[PDB]
Amino acid sequence: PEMVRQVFDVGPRYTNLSYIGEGAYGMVCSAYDNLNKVRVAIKKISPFEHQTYCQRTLREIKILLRFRHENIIGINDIIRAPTIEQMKDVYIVQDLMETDLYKLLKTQHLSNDHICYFLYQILRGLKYIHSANVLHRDLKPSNLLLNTTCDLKICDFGLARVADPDHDHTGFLTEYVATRWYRAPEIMLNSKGYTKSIDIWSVGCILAEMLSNRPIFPGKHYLDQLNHILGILGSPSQEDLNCIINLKARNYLLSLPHKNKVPWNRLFPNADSKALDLLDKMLTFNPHKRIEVEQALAHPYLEQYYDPSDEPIAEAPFKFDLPKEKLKELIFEETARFQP
Numbered sequence: 001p002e003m004v005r006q007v008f009d010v011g012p013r014y015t016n017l018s019y020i021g022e023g024a025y026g027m028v029c030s031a032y033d034n035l036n037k038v039r040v041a042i043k044k045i046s047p048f049e050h051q052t053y054c055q056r057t058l059r060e061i062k063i064l065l066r067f068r069h070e071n072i073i074g075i076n077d078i079i080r081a082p083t084i085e086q087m088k089d090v091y092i093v094q095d096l097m098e099t100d101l102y103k104l105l106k107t108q109h110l111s112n113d114h115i116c117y118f119l120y121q122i123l124r125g126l127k128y129i130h131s132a133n134v135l136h137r138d139l140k141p142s143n144l145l146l147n148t149t150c151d152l153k154i155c156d157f158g159l160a161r162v163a164d165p166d167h168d169h170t171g172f173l174t175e176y177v178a179t180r181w182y183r184a185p186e187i188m189l190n191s192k193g194y195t196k197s198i199d200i201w202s203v204g205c206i207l208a209e210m211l212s213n214r215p216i217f218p219g220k221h222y223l224d225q226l227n228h229i230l231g232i233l234g235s236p237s238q239e240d241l242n243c244i245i246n247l248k249a250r251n252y253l254l255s256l257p258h259k260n261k262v263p264w265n266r267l268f269p270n271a272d273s274k275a276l277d278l279l280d281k282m283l284t285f286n287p288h289k290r291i292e293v294e295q296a297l298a299h300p301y302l303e304q305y306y307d308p309s310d311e312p313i314a315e316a317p318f319k320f321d322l323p324k325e326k327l328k329e330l331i332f333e334e335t336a337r338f339q340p
């Protein structure tokens, strides 16, 4: 098998490999697709030793194979051994994307037109995801891929879940949903992250980050995150507190000194006022008052792009959400369509 930086066993269809990046149990390379005569991205995944890894791998594969949308990364092919016994790794082949929003924001200032276009594409993809009754649950710049013409595709559904609002409530300081900086305040207070509003919060954080090239709520650790959120939004209203029945959560908030809201236009003096209005509606403390994806698409900031007839929804929503060996068998089965 061809080697990179580690076995990268993808031939003969895919050749001329170039290292792109790595992970805890995989590696990403670019490669030439000899059938389609174009270069592609290939992700090597080696999840079989660990149950949790098998879970995330199965979620990613099952969701992406079922979704078909311009703003969601597709799976073009899956490479693996012909038998379960011989299967040690799985390679997911995808469209080759020039960069991601994390990398881009490290060195590039976005024009207002780019911010608007990117946000439109994120929400368009998210509308489809939510219409399938699915929560992405880890939206952040590194999970937004971009090609050389700024087409944006949402990736990494390994942490996704089927929405379950009737079972969202939980206690204080227990939950661990999303990546820290993109995590909604309620995750720390009383939410398991089983409602669509969790994703809208993350999009708001991404919007803020596009406006300034710095994360808006840069918590230094899990417990610090709420400090940053409240430091900008200010103290929640009585009405918003009244919505939190859990006493540990409500009393924590009541114990804090009063904090004033910091106006968005002071944080972002160069920003389009319509962007800031939308930002405020996504970064609303009360998840019940928080703007929903279809409302966000219809906001004046996005008027140049908005067209509900060209913002498709899923044909077939997911209706509902085991040892690593069953999981391996399921991954083997889910990937069979691509054999030989």
Ligand SMILES: [N-]=[N+]=NC[C@H]1O[C@@H](n2c(Br)nc3c(N)ncnc32)[C@H](O)[C@@H]1O
Pocket (backbone or CB within 6 Å): 020, 021, 022, 023, 024, 026, 027, 028, 041, 073, 094, 095, 096, 097, 098, 099, 100, 145
């Ligand atoms: N592990 N992982 N490696 C992370 C690197 O792979 C990059 N990457 C991913 Br994930 N998918 C990609 C794709 N379809 N095309 C190009 N680069 C990609 C990503 O931007 C990051 O740089």
